[PDB]
Design a protein around this ligand. Structure first.
Ligand SMILES: [Zn+2]
Length: 353
């Protein structure tokens, strides 16, 4: 219950709205030009922009000079094959689509090559950018490409495949929103497409499931009550809490920047944990504005338990553990645990620094 202070922090974050908005505009102008270029290419005919991520969830609170952008590509009749026993990684094949389809230039045997596709994606964007100081492309550190706009704004660009078929079985027990949002809503959401982003596992040519569009839909229609946050009597602190969790993690990564201890943690971990706290606390009355202090403390406490037990399930794919030993070592989780505990015990000093 340090609610008075948390409000002041939120109020401070609002002062960044204009810079972030101005920056978003420049990114948009550039990313629109790029989309027009991509659409001229045979391989990327059904390419489109996916308006997802923190900016579109109204939850981007820092870093006017950093954006993530996702392009989507409609890929009909996809066949998936699970990579090993990872529940989130897959190989991509096609259902009787061998020829007359421009995407087949990207095949290696029967599987679609992420590496070939990304290389052509990058090459197209580079060509376009080379045809036009105010926009450059950073060289490879491996998020397909990264741009620098006006020598100032860094934009990470991700290509995603869109599949309109039903979600893979590993999502069967995920998205536990039945008692928060409804069974009805869960049914409707699961009829929507899923996405696949290029992502190495273990190793190569695998793709990882992505649901950034569902995450956006939940965040922008987030109450048990259909009118949550539409009137003064129903202002909940759910987004405030998510904002504070993200800022906490950003501020900590900034503080221990010289250490490598915090490099593996990202806002996705915070966002994932936050959705789990929404599931555990399904009623809007558990997110009363006046209880901002208790609610933020639930979020922090939840996040600490994930660290201590080394378990943070992907919200969509329950068997995919974001905090497994294979992704993040015990020492890093133990370091973050200690810092969060210190921070909580001292009314969050990093919120002023
Ligand atoms: Zn609300």
């Amino acid at each position: 219950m340090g609610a008075s202070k948390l409000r002041a922090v939120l109020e401070k974050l609002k002062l960044s709205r204009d810079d972030i908005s101005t920056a978003a505009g420049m990114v948009k102008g550039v990313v629109d030009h790029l989309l027009l270029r991509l659409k001229c290419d045979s391989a990327f005919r059904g390419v489109g922009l996916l308006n997802t991520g923190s900016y579109y969830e109204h939850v981007k609170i820092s870093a006017p000079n950093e954006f993530d952008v996702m392009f989507k590509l409609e890929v009909p009749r996809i066949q998936l094959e699970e990579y090993s026993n990872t529940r989130a990684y897959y190989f991509v094949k096609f259902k009787r689509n061998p020829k007359e389809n421009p995407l087949s230039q990207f095949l290696e045997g029967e599987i679609l090559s992420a590496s070939k596709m990304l290389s052509k994606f990058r090459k197209i964007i580079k060509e376009e950018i080379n045809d036009i100081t105010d926009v450059i492309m950073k060289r490879k550190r491996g998020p397909a490409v990264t741009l620098l706009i006006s020598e100032k704004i860094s934009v990470d660009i991700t290509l995603a495949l869109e599949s309109k078929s039903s979600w893979p079985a590993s999502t069967q027990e995920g998205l536990r929103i039945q008692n928060w949002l409804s069974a009805k809503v869960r049914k409707q959401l699961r009829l929507k497409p899923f996405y696949l982003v290029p992502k190495h596992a273990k190793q190569e040519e695998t793709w990882r499931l992505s649901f950034s569009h569902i995450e956006k839909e939940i965040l922008n229609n987030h109450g048990k009550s259909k009118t949550c946050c539409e009137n003064k009597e129903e202002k909940c602190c759910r987004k405030d809490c998510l904002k504070l969790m993200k800022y906490l993690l950003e501020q900590l990564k900034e503080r221990f920047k010289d250490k490598k201890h915090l490099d593996k943690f990202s806002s996705y971990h915070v966002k994932t944990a936050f959705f789990h706290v929404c599931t555990q606390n399904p009623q809007d009355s558990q997110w009363d504005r006046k209880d901002l202090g208790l609610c933020f403390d639930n979020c922090v406490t939840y996040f600490l338990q994930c660290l201590r037990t080394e378990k943070l399930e992907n919200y969509f794919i329950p068997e995919f553990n974001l905090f497994s030993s294979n992704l993040i070592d015990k020492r890093s989780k133990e370091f973050l645990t200690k810092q969060i505990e210190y921070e909580r015990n001292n009314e969050f000093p990093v919120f002023d620094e």
